[PDB]
RNA sequence: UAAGCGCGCCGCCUGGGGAGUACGGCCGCAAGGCUGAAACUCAAAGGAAUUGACGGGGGCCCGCACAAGCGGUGGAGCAUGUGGUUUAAUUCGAAGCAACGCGAAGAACCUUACCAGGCCUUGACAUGCUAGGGAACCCGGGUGAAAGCCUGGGGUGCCCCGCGAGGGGAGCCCUAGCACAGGUGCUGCAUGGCCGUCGUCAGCUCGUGCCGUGAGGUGUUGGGUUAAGUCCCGCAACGAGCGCAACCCCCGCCGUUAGUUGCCAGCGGUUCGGCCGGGCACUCUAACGGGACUGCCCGCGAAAGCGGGAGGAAGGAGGGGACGACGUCUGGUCAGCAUGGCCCUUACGGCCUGGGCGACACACGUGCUACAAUGCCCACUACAAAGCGAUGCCACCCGGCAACGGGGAGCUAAUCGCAAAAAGGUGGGCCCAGUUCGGAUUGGGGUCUGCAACCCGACCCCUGAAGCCGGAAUCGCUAGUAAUCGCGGAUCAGCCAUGCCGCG
């Protein structure tokens, strides 16, 4: 807001892997404060990453997140009559946030019926450079670039 | 629509109840009703006496009423005939036996209700309001108030356009909760309807 | 004061600061409880608000004014430099000397020259 | 219909149901609290004067 | 380089409009120029400066204002308020924000202000005067839907003439007469009181001084800083007041007091639930206190303050309340109340029975339940807080599939009860389907409240609508917040509460 930069909330680390990044993601899976369900959904899903590969879920998790972060996004800026979608950098923080949200949002578009499978497969696909999360992210750099002409308003 | 009742705002702190009894759910209803027919009767009969309060205590289901007047002379009578009937009137209207004590309001010019009543009485008798007001405030301050405010509502001098002539001196820190701002409110009934009068007397702190 | 024993912390902060600026601005001006009988100003243009006030109360104005100033609004002028510390001290000191002598009890020249530049 | 309705409220009639709360100063029939016997206006007006014993502005 | 001080000479003005127009005359190729009125009309037109307000002006600065987000409304059913239509009546008010789950914290009769019809008039209510009777009170008889009208009885305590005849008598009640009552009939621009709102925004003023012919200005323009006219610095100002803040309550840490109905750490006993001894330590309860102040450290800064650090349960206003300046809005309310004025008087007053405020071709606001798998059902198992209750909360039996009904303890309630908390957890069932999603609508059979549930109550038990996430648009929220899950209360016989205020 207007006065100051606003403090970013330090999340409490994860109770299993001890990663702050896992509770973020869990907090995105969470709906109506039903956090038990959420973390219960994320851990089942980590076990699905075992059954379908001898890889640690954390490693693969961290790899999905890295492939869904965007580099640049169109951010809407206004002239005063007509409006230009302008391309520009993405913050570290914003990247993480975008990445986890898409991941979740993407995972729940999926056609399998349990959430834990949906989140696992979508994690698997995204670390393999191509889920629906990755399209979103791609779409977003293909929205910049499609508009690289207007990169001289970089606000 | 604003400013809350400077008495209601104090109550626990700074300023005390005008009725202090206890009653449970089954009882409050009826004692409160009495209180009210009590205050109501004394409110009109002891008009000439200039009454500021009508405090009401109640113990072994027996009722003591302190009437804080400026003119005990008037409530009493010559040798106390008037206060006789007054003690009997209350008893008539309450099925009970009621102590009725008088208490001189030491300085009536620090009694917000009285100051207010006086200005109201002045108005009812076609006195100039602005002056009446301003004087009331001089009287209060002369009598050692730390501050005083007086407000006459509207239809001053009989106008079609209702108004609101205020006037004040010293501090009247209404937001300050340790203050001890007596407050008072009388009507002026007139040929031309009602004007309300508010007096605030500020007396000291802690 | 044994009243300072008590008193909120907020009163301490507020009252100390208050005194402090009182102390600051009113140190000289407290010793007189009456309109003076004359004022003595160094730069009367620099200090023209003060000259204006005296002029208005029929108080005599004495000043050490230099070429910058309007002598017509000074009753007793010391026409001379009013910017050199050296020049003022000369004239402030001899002027005060004159005062004491004339009040009874001639004296020594006081501290002035603290470190003259 | 008011003065005679504050009156018909006191008489208690055929059928116990027909009786109703009705404020004790205001004749008001609505928003009368059974503890005080008072309308919600009446109760505020008195509360502020310190004429409802015990009753205080609440704040938590 | 006068708009100063003066002399010379020229030109021009004499309220605004009519109008630089008309007429005339002169000039011009023409366009038009110059010269230039009046009627009539207005009570001004106008200069400059002042305080505001305003800007599709500027600078600086704020708020869930946007932005970033998360969840909704707008679509569907239904609940509810409103427009409108309708009606005998669908009483009345509220109208952008700030009217529309608002007055209403409880419309079947009551409420109730409306409609119909049946009834009453000194009246349902008050103060008082005159008079034959009656003089408290209480009971049935007709006629009625009920009011009411008509009726017939039981039967005078009291002051007192008194040992009584008999006779004075005050309460009190009916009959008629007189004053008077009654009016939710009108006016919220006649009002008071109370409320909304701009806005918890950071403002609004004053006394003296000083500036200005004056309105007025300074103070309160500036620089910094703050949540803040908060503070600092500066300054023809120095102060002060209403506001801000603080003083008040709740929540967070700890202490002292207190130890039952509350607690149970170590004992001892034990029909297990602290049940008995013990004990108040801890938890609580609730009353009084302590505790935070940029106080300390580092850095920046002239200062105020800021960034960071340490300690501390807690910092930089710790988190929430209460609290609303001078004023604004011809804001809201004569239907809470009060009130000036206006109006009604076998009626615009009053009583009743019934209807209506619940009407439905539509439109809108606020909500609820949803469309499902992060879900739904069933079983089992947990963990709250704040409230409420002795014509009331109801344990526990029993009967009933059940609502509920029979019994029937305990509880003037830190004792007993409402009480099951739900979401959660554990089992199991569903397997993507208009479905074991969703529960509208409709049929039946029951229960309960109440004189009475047809219009019109809730609840229980055996059809299964729309709806596959909602257009333009639009709302809420910055943290224990939103989101989600239940719990309690006021009103209240019952309840149309999915509302409200609270609690976790
Ligand atoms: Mg009722
Ligand atoms: Mg011509
Ligand atoms: Mg937004
Ligand atoms: Mg809808
Ligand atoms: Mg009306
Ligand atoms: Mg108004
Ligand atoms: Mg209106
Ligand atoms: Mg109006
Ligand atoms: Mg209605
Ligand atoms: Mg369909
Ligand atoms: Mg489906």
The domain tally of chain B equals 2
Question: Alpha-carbon distance A134 to A94, whole Å?
Answer: 16
Contact D35, D47 (CB under 8 A): no
Instruction: Give me the phi and psi of B63, to 5 degrees please.
Output: -120, 120
Question: Alpha-carbon distance A41 to B25, whole Å?
Answer: 54
Structural domain including D27 reads: 1-60
Structural domain including B85 reads: 16-106
Residues 81-120 of A with CB under 7 A from strand E: 94, 97-98, 101, 104, 107-108, 113-116, 118
* Residue B77 and residue B37 share a domain: yes
Any idea which fold A1-155 has? Answer: Ribosomal Protein S7 (1.10.455)
Q: B188: Cβ–Cβ under 8 A, 6 or more apart, which residues? A: B120, B121, B123, B124, B152, B194, B195, B196, B197
Question: Alpha-carbon distance C15 to B22, whole Å?
Answer: 46
Contact B14, B175 (CB under 8 A): no
Count Cα neighbours of B165 within 13 Å in the Cβ-side half-sphere: 17
Instruction: Give me the phi and psi of C72, to 5 degrees please.
Output: -60, -20
Contact B23, B31 (CB under 8 A): yes
- For this PDB entry, the determination method is X-ray
- β-strands B98-104, B147-152 pairing: unpaired
Name the token pair of A93: 């923080």
Question: Alpha-carbon distance B149 to B168, whole Å?
Answer: 4
For residue B151, is it within any domain? yes
E strands within A9-114? 72-78, 83-89
**Cβ–Cβ of B16/D47 closer than 8 Å?**
no
Instruction: Give the annotated binding-site residues of D.
Output: 23, 26, 39, 42
**Residues of chain D positioned with their CB less than 8 A from the CB of B11:** 50, 56-57
Name the token pair of B94: 């309450």
Question: Alpha-carbon distance B17 to B55, whole Å?
Answer: 8
Give Cα separations from B82 to A1, B69, B72, B73, B78 (angstroms). 72, 14, 11, 10, 8
* Residue B131 and residue B102 share a domain: no
Contact A87, A74 (CB under 8 A): yes
Question: Alpha-carbon distance A23 to A42, whole Å?
Answer: 10
* Residue B89 and residue B138 share a domain: no
* Residue B155 and residue B136 share a domain: yes
Instruction: Give me the phi and psi of C50, to 5 degrees please.
Output: -60, -45
Which of B75, B106, B137 is the C-terminal boundary of a domain?
Answer: B106
According to DSSP, the residues that pair with B19 across neighbouring strands are: B56
Instruction: Give me the phi and psi of A86, to 5 degrees please.
Output: -95, 135
First to last CA, chain C: 42
For residue B7, is it within any domain? no
Question: Alpha-carbon distance B198 to B119, whole Å?
Answer: 9
Contact B169, B137 (CB under 8 A): yes
Question: Alpha-carbon distance B201 to B138, whole Å?
Answer: 12
Name the token pair of B53: 């309060």
Question: Alpha-carbon distance B67 to C87, whole Å?
Answer: 80
**Residues of chain B positioned with their CB less than 8 A from the CB of D50:** 7-8, 11, 15-19
Question: Alpha-carbon distance D14 to D17, whole Å?
Answer: 8
Dihedral over Cα of C1, C5, C6, C9: its sign = positive
E strands within A58-137? 72-78, 83-89
**Cβ–Cβ of D35/B29 closer than 8 Å?**
yes
Contact D49, B18 (CB under 8 A): yes
Closest to B70 measured CA to CA, from B100, B38, B107 = B107
Contacting D with CB below 8 Å, chain B residues are 4-5, 7-9, 11-12, 15-23, 25, 28-29, 32-33, 35-36, 39
Residues 171-200 of B with CB under 7 A from strand E: 171-179, 185, 187, 189-198
| D abuts A (3+ Cβ pairs < 8 Å) | no
Give Cα separations from A9 to A5, A88, C8 (angstroms). 12, 25, 37
In a mutagenesis test of the B interface, which of D32, D33, D44, D49 is the best target, namely the one with the most B β-carbons within 10 Å?
D49
Q: Give the CATH number for residue D30.
A: 4.10.830.10
Question: Alpha-carbon distance A116 to A127, whole Å?
Answer: 16
Question: Alpha-carbon distance A102 to A64, whole Å?
Answer: 11
Q: How many CB atoms lie within 10 A of CB B145?
A: 26
Question: Alpha-carbon distance A126 to B172, whole Å?
Answer: 70
Radius of gyration of chain D (CA): 14
According to DSSP, the residues that pair with B198 across neighbouring strands are: B151, B185
Q: B100: Cβ–Cβ under 8 A, 6 or more apart, which residues? A: B65, B67, B83, B86, B87, B90
Question: Alpha-carbon distance B120 to B151, whole Å?
Answer: 10
Which of B106, B138, B166 is the C-terminal boundary of a domain?
Answer: B106
- β-strands C61-63, C39-41 pairing: parallel
Radius of gyration of chain C (CA): 19
Question: Alpha-carbon distance B67 to D39, whole Å?
Answer: 27
Question: Alpha-carbon distance A133 to C116, whole Å?
Answer: 79
Dihedral over Cα of A57, A63, A69, A70: its sign = negative
For residue B11, is it within any domain? no
Q: A26: Cβ–Cβ under 8 A, 6 or more apart, which residues? A: A14, A35, A38, A39, A42
* Residue B118 and residue B98 share a domain: no
The domain tally of chain D equals 1
Q: How many CB atoms lie within 10 A of CB C18?
A: 11
Q: Give the CATH number for residue B100.
A: 3.30.300.20
Question: Alpha-carbon distance B26 to B18, whole Å?
Answer: 21
Contact B123, B199 (CB under 8 A): no
Q: A77: Cβ–Cβ under 8 A, 6 or more apart, which residues? A: A83, A84, A86, A153, A155
Question: Alpha-carbon distance B162 to B101, whole Å?
Answer: 41
Q: Which nucleotide is nearest to B171 (CA to C1')?
A: E241
For residue B3, is it within any domain? no
Q: What is the resolution of this structure in A?
A: 2.9
Which sequence spans correspond to the domains of chain A?
Answer: 1-155
Which ligand has an atom closest to residue B162 CA? 6
């Amino acid at each position: 807001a207007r006065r100051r930069r606003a403090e970013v909330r330090q999340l409490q680390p994860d109770l299993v892997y001890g990663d702050v990044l896992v509770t973020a993601f869990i907090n995105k899976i969470m709906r109506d404060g039903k956090k038990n369900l959420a973390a219960r959904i994320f851990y089942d899903a980590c076990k699905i990453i075992q059954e379908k590969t001898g890889q640690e879920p954390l490693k693969v998790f961290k790899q999905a997140v890295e492939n869904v972060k965007p580099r640049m996004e169109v951010r809407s800026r206004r002239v005063g009559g007509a409006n230009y979608q302008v391309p520009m950098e993405v913050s570290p923080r914003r990247q993480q946030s975008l990445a986890l949200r898409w991941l979740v949002q993407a995972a729940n578009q999926r056609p399998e019926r349990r959430a834990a499978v949906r989140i696992a497969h979508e994690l698997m696909d995204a670390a393999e450079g191509k889920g629906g999360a990755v399209k979103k992210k791609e779409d977003v750099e293909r929205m910049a670039e499609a508009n690289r002409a207007y990169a001289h308003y970089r606000w | 629509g604003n400013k809350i009742h400077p008495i209601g705002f104090r109550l626990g702190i700074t300023r005390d109840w005008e009725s202090r009894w206890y009653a449970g759910k089954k009882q409050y209803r009826h004692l409160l009703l009495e209180d009210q027919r009590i205050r109501g009767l004394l409110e009109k009969e002891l008009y000439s006496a200039g009454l500021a309060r009508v405090d009401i205590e109640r113990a072994a289901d027996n009722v003591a009423v302190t009437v804080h007047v400026a003119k005990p002379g008037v409530v009493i009578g010559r040798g106390g005939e008037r206060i006789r009937v007054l003690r009997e009137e209350l008893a008539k209207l309450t099925g009970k036996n009621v102590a009725l004590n008088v208490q001189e309001v030491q300085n009536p010019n620090l009694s917000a209700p009285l100051v207010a009543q006086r200005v109201a009485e002045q108005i009812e008798r076609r006195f100039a309001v602005r002056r009446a007001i301003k004087q009331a405030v001089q009287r209060v301050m002369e009598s050692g108030a730390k501050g005083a405010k007086v407000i006459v509502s509207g239809r001053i001098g009989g106008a079609e356009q209702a108004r609101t002539e205020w006037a004040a001196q010293g501090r009247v820190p209404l937001h300050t909760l340790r203050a001890n701002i007596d407050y008072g409110f009388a009507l002026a009934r007139t040929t031309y309807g009602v004007l309300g009068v508010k007096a605030y007397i500020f007396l000291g702190e802690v | 004061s044994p009243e300072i024993e008590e008193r909120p912390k907020k009163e301490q902060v507020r009252l100390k600061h208050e005194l402090e600026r009182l102390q600051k601005y009113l140190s000289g001006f407290r010793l007189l409880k009456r309109l003076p009988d004359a004022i003595f100003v160094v730069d009367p243009t620099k200090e023209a608000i003060a000259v204006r006030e005296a002029r208005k109360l029929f108080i005599p104005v004495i000043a050490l004014a230099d070429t910058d100033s309007d002598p017509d609004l000074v009753d007793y002028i010391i026409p001379g430099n009013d910017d050199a510390i050296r020049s003022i001290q000369l004239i402030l000191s001899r002027a005060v000397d004159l005062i004491i002598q004339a009040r009874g009890g001639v004296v020594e020249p006081s501290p002035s020259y603290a470190l003259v530049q | 219909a008011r003065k005679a309705l504050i009156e018909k409220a006191k008489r208690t009639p055929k059928f116990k149901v027909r009786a109703y709360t009705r404020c004790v100063r205001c004749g008001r029939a609505r928003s009368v609290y059974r503890f005080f016997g008072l309308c919600r206006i009446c109760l505020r007006e008195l509360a502020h004067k310190g004429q409802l014993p015990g009753v205080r502005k609440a704040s938590w």
